Symmetry: C3
Subunit: 315 residues, 3 copies
Amino acid sequence: YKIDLDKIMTKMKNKSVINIDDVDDEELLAILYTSKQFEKILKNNEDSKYLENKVFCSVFLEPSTRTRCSFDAAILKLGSKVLNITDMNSTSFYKGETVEDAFKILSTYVDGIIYRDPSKKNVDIAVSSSSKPIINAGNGTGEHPTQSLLDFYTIHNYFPFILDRNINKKLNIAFVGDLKNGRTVHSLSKLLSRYNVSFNFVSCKSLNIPKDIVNTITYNLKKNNFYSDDSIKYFDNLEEGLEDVHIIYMTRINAFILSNKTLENTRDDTKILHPLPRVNEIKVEVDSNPKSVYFTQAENGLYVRMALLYLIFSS
Amino acid sequence: DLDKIMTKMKNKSVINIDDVDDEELLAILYTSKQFEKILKNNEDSKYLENKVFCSVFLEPSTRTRCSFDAAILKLGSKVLNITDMNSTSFYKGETVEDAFKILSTYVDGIIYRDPSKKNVDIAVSSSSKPIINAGNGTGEHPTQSLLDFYTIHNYFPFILDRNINKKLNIAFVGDLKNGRTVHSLSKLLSRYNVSFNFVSCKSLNIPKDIVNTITYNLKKNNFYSDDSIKYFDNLEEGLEDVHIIYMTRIQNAFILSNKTLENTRDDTKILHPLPRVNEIKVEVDSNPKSVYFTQAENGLYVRMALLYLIFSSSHPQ
Amino acid sequence: IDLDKIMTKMKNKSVINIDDVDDEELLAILYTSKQFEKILKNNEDSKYLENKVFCSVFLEPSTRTRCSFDAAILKLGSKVLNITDMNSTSFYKGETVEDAFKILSTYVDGIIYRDPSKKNVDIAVSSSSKPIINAGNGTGEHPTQSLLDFYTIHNYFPFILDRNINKKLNIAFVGDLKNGRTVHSLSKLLSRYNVSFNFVSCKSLNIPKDIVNTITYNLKKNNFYSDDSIKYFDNLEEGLEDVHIIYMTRIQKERFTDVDEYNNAFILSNKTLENTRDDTKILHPLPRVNEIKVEVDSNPKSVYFTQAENGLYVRMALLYLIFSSTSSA
Ligand SMILES: COCCNC(=O)c1cc(-c2ccccc2)sc1N
Ligand code: NA
């Protein structure tokens, strides 16, 4: 189709996925391609059991029901099995024990571990100590790689020229709301800036985007000669914010409540993403508007997570 | 006719016992009996593989959850469990509509228990996938009524005949005001040729609304008389000529002993949704009239039946 | 030797106490456990017990034993309903254990049960129509810990099984011997063989007399008892002298009236391992907190991580032996 695969599978076998930076251009292509294969299989109610005989541990040490249920659905649909650790925090699970000991032991029982922990540190220790691959399901640095991949998958389906890399093939996107703490913005901003992309950061002063992320965007745009001083624009209101943008990404939380009113002066092709849950940021009326795709976006998580597990754990 | 009735039930939500009509009950009771023999003969039970369900229990209800999960696993399917949360810890903020719109894109079907009447209704509205109610706050617990009715049908199969000469009599005993298990089953029974002895204390008398549904449904099949519904204060009169004694829970006055079972019909059988406390004495467990343990066991066979009928995309023998 | 006979003996066996496991059964277990070790280490199919549906009831947080038992059930190719993050009272609610187990056992092929209550597990076996494996209770009965403890020893010193007057194993149990009920269970299993014991403790945490009496009784039964069969020490220097196995116990803040009582007398270092036999191996049921230093993990005498890993293989063996329908693969 585009790139070799099956030597990309060889490259991904037993790979830990902690940060979106652990995923290079070829791996992204395998994932996006594999994700699309699982989409059609499931949409045709065909056999999905392409990874059996595998037993995974799911460790969720913060309530994050939707990501856990996603990862469990992916594991079960591939025809594998999973033991769950759940409804506990960092302290009830470790009790006394060091993370290093806990992961050294847990990794002798299972083929791989899905790990969510508020602590940035704990996931890094867990990779140090685990004899088995770990997928980060979310931590405290805002590394949530599988959210980036399904965010990117969703975009790719409506605008596949993001992948084509060409000063012609330029996508514009507006991130809106809490840009300081929207770690989902940061992770995706990082993946996007590898391609021909422009950014409208719509925030209220105290929640402006961090400079560290601006510098990574700038660095990565320059690497592919897609950077200009018109690559990044800041806005204080939705009016101007929501303009010539192919994607509107709303963050969790306000100042910016998306209505059918405020979507009147957007491109006709604009699509609206939201990692969810929404609390007020997007009004129920918008759900009917064919520009909204946040529910397809959540659905895509299944197909992407199946792809990632198949690519890493298949023998 | 299975390849008609199955086709009618495919992707059906079961929220209330009135979502189950005459022919659906017959498919269920027939399929339930097939799963009974298969399991009792240690034969292959994997009639529904490659299916992934979500079980959401937002109230501690271990027996029903374990039942539904056993059924899903024994049919050869898989299940993600949501558990030890209440309405607020799950939905940490999120609308039920969003939560079910998303969750239903991951799974083939959902078993949902929630104290809230409202939530289950919203869940059906928003879900792209079938829901089976495992219990809510309206007292809709359909699968309990089905296994209650399954158990009765095994000892007295003429309830299904609707024959003016083959009437079943049953005594419901204990908390009839709040025993919504009584209400759901009373509703299913009154569709057939059945008579009711309500044995209660004043403040726990059966509600008027239930009496009107019984009356309505008896009349519908011309099985109604003034001796269709009899009220009692005591077991001696209560247990008179009753084929079934259904004891209720309490959250005492009516304690079933071997004494109180002496002047019952020989064929009388004793049901109890469980758990019991002091309403039935351990001595009665030995008495061959008691079937409350077989009744809980029947829930596996009925829940398997209902899942197979709804989710199946070689009909079982 | 004769697995076709011993498997037939174990089919539908409940395993509550290490005394429910006799000589022949131990040998089936140790033999089967070693088969599952190689299968898993060769990435071969391990699905020797499919179409089985188990309930795992954990009514105290004991996450490592539960995850172990879950891994074993899943790797054998079977399925499990989990009860978890409950205590005796939130589960049961009103209900009698007898009713609860009479019902639960009609749904499933077998039950893994952990409950602090000694009583509850006994009632559960009496009422259950289906086999129960005790995963740990309040009498200190934790049979699967004994078996994997003994499995690990047997791999480094297989002459424990020979019961040969001239091939005696010596072992040091170290730390909390009063409350280390892991020591008690294993002491009981070991004393059936040609074994000698160094109990290394602080006065307050000396081994209980009733355990010493069982050891003494069981050694005498096989004519392996002497006055040098059981030696007490206060210190590691004498403790660790000529011992093939050093078993470190846990020290659990709980069991101690107050935080002050807790304060960590016997800390195994590379220093303290200088005057041990060359072949000595170090076990620890885990988790550790301070009693073994991280430096020791590199020292080739340490096997406590292999020991935890062995629990998968032993739990697979035990499930396969007990639940496999009239099987021979
Ligand atoms: C972080 O480590 C958790 C404990 N891991 C374990 O080894 C474990 C759990 C148990 C336990 C531990 C303390 C108090 C009561 C029971 S028994 C067992 N196999
Ligand atoms: Na499970």
